[PDB]
Design a protein around this ligand. Structure first.
Ligand SMILES: *[C@@H]1O[C@H](CO)[C@@H](O[C@@H]2O[C@H](CO)[C@@H](O)[C@H](O)[C@H]2NC(C)=O)[C@H](O)[C@H]1NC(C)=O
Ligand SMILES: *[C@@H]1O[C@H](CO)[C@@H](O[C@@H]2O[C@H](CO)[C@@H](O)[C@H](O)[C@H]2NC(C)=O)[C@H](O)[C@H]1NC(C)=O
Ligand SMILES: Nc1ccn([C@H]2C[C@H](O)[C@@H](CO)O2)c(=O)n1
Ligand SMILES: *[C@@H]1O[C@H](CO)[C@@H](O)[C@H](O)[C@H]1NC(C)=O
Ligand SMILES: [Fe+3]
Ligand SMILES: [Zn+2]
Ligand SMILES: [Zn+2]
Lengths: 335, 6
């Protein structure tokens, strides 16, 4: 009765989930929704068990009583003696990325430029940059700051969706799932790369994984890191190798959430699913890799090395951290 | 300040 129902956001995640479902012998099966918020509702109704969320979505889910269960953990250096499953998580760097050739764009000259955001309510793509901008401007009018944006999940007719491209048919403009061409870390970095926007709010790892041949994908295969700079909060611009001194925040890793009443079962099932399909899994690369989707970050980030146990059975507030939680609260006072 | 958005 530890069949776990995974919630897949949009059709491409649904398709990966189906392949996992098949390979797991139906130990995992799939519910699908059009948006992460709808997936959280399925979970609240007990029609789905679990999904992996960005931190801004953990805030939504945790306000509704869902709880973190295991965290994404990626490649490390300190704690290298520890198994991935037991290693604490280190968070990721939220950065603002621009074209090196867009000279004299700084953090301080962002007003009226064109932005690319991973999705509204996400950590690096939205709560951190807009939280900081609202704070620095003294103004809740975050929808008037950038001239045009792609911020998937905003009103499709608003300027915050103007740059979004929708799917290969032009349908679904600005839907917050991977059907939207500019959705997600990779979508928003693509919106910069193709110069639809002036600035992408993604994380440090995005830049590296879609540059210098790390991605074979047609829009990314020719990008060189040297053509990009980070915007530091002090007004300077740095190379993308300096993200440790040039970021907007350290974000809590993406984590699996579930209803509390199902958390222990979801954990057990996932720990065994990743022994089969995770990074050195018995059946990956052979049959299925849970943490691969050709750079589209479907269900989990493709840079995930394992899902790791959480120290201290944290509540969603403890997992997010008090400072991040309050930053999210404060920003939400605007809208 | 507090309560589920659904
Ligand atoms: C920013 O992100 C990149 C990509 O994740 C990091 O580079 C990786 O770091 C690990 C070990 O530290 C290396 O073994 C990988 O080979 C690197 N990956 C690639 C694709 O180059 C970089 O360390 C991160 N920088 C910071 C400050 O976090
Ligand atoms: C935006 O401004 C508010 C106000 O300073 C910040 O919230 C404060 O955060 C500090 C540090 O975590 C807390 O001790 C205060 O109690 C919080 N203040 C209030 C009034 O709630 C918030 O962190 C800022 N946002 C960002 C993204 O930096
Ligand atoms: N991808 C990440 C995530 C975190 N950090 C480390 C550097 C931050 O400065 C530190 C904050 O405690 O965590 C890092 O270098 N790279
Ligand atoms: C499915 O779960 C059962 C019960 O724990 C286990 O015996 C089996 O190995 C699992 N198979 C897969 C492919 O997950
Ligand atoms: Fe994120
Ligand atoms: Zn820092
Ligand atoms: Zn606690």
């Amino acid at each position: 009765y530890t069949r776990v129902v995974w919630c897949a956001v949009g059709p491409e995640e649904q398709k990966k989930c189906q392949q996992w479902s098949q390979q797991s012998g139906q130990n995992v099966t799939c519910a699908t929704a059009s948006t992460t918020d709808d997936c959280i509702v399925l979970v609240l109704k007990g029609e789905a068990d679990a999904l992996n969320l960005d931190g801004g979505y953990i805030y939504t889910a945790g306000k509704c009583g869902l709880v973190p269960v295991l965290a994404e953990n990626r490649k490390s250096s300190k704690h290298s003696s520890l198994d991935c499953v037991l290693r604490p998580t280190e968070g990721y760097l939220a950065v603002a990325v621009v074209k090196k050739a867009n000279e004299g764009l700084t953090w301080n000259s962002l007003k009226d430029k064109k932005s690319c955001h991973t999705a509204v309510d996400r950590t690096a793509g939205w709560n951190i940059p807009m939280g900081l901008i609202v704070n620095q401007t003294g103004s809740c009018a975050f929808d008037e700051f950038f001239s045009q944006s792609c911020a998937p999940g905003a009103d499709p007719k608003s300027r915050l969706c103007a740059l979004c491209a929708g799917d290969d048919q032009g349908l679904d403009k600005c839907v917050p799932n991977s059907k939207e061409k500019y959705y997600g870390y990779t979508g928003a970095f693509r919106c910069l790369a193709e110069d639809v926007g002036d600035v992408a709010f993604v994380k440090n790892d995005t830049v590296w994984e879609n540059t210098n041949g790390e991605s074979t994908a047609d829009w990314a295969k020719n990008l060189k890191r040297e053509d990009f700079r980070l915007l530091c909060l002090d007004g300077t611009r740095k190379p993308v190798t300096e993200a440790q001194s040039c970021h907007l925040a350290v974000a809590p890793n993406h984590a699996v959430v579930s209803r509390s009443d199902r958390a222990a079962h979801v954990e057990q099932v996932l720990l065994h699913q990743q022994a089969l399909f995770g990074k050195n899994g018995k059946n990956c690369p052979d049959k299925f890799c849970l943490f691969k989707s050709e750079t589209k970050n479907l269900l989990f980030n493709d840079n995930t090395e394992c899902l790791a146990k959480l120290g201290g059975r944290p509540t969603y507030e403890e997992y997010l951290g008090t400072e991040y939680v309050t930053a999210i609260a404060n920003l939400k006072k605007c809208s | 300040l507090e309560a589920c958005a659904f």
